[PDB]
Amino acid sequence: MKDFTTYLSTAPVIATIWFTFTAGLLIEINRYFPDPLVFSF
Template sequence: MQGLPRYLSSAPVLATIWISLQAAGLIVFNYYFPDLLFHPLP
């Protein structure tokens, strides 16, 4: 049970970093390919 508090305290930090990286990746992708994220339906 010693590692459980460490895991619970680091999981929100890791989740925040992961979500921030995904958001930055989407921003960069949308900058270079602005029309690929929002395709109009045929």
């Protein structure tokens, strides 16, 4: 599956994994920390 891992390392597959990662990071943040308009403490 070395060719399958080179397919997993192509541009749109990395794009759709990394954008789901950076989407579902910010989404879990806005679940556990609702409505951040201002930098609080």
